[PDB]
Amino acid sequence: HESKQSIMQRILTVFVFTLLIATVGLFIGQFVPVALMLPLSILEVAMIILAFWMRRRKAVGYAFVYTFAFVSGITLFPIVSHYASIAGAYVVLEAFGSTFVIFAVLGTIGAKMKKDLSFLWSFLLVAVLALAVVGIFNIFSPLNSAAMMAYSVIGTIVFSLYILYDLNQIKHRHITEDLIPVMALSLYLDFINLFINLLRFFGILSS
Ligand SMILES: [Ca+2]
Ligand SMILES: [Cl-]
Ligand SMILES: [Cl-]
Ligand SMILES: [Cl-]
Secondary structure, eight states: OOOOHHHHHHHHHHHHHHHHHHHHHHHHHTTTTTGGGGGGOOOOOOHHHHHHHOOSOOOHHHHHHHHHHHHHHHHHHHHHHHHHHHOTTTHHHHHHHHHHHHHHHHHHHHOOOSSOOOOOOOHHHHHHHHHOOOHHHHSOOOHHHHHHHHHHHHHHHHHHHHHHHHHHHHHEEEEOOGGGGHHHHHHHHHHHHHHHHHHHHHHHHHH
């Protein structure tokens, strides 16, 4: 018989694994020819849209989640290589480091706080959809550095709040063991989208 503790620890374990796998994918992605990479603007907004689309009460399997992490990791190399090329490779470390402790702190607080943050669900959905709209607009009408930085700050706030909210709902809601991959998948999409926002922000800022 599972407890709230074990289910949490299992979700977090799968989440850590999605990061490790994605990192392997990222490493592999450096070998993809330039002529076979998707446009930066397309890849960036794609992760936002997926973050929304994967957020369903549908039990997905470990196979999907782990394969998703591997393939998405590969496709995020053009994003990493771009902002590294305009601000130095060190900004990737900066972005990752900043994403890590934000997730670690906000994740812990959300998972430990007594307040039920369930009321944020609709607000957060609208916000992510709003980021998707701007992300799509960017494809056909490229925003400047100033606007893109403002976009990154909003995106940072939205996904930071989602991390707090997600860990909070894992504690408060009724999560069964068949929901473990989809809960971890959301945490993974939180991390990556927060990482992309910070990478873009600090990359543009140091350019
Ligand atoms: Ca069991
Ligand atoms: Cl319990
Ligand atoms: Cl599935
Ligand atoms: Cl269960």
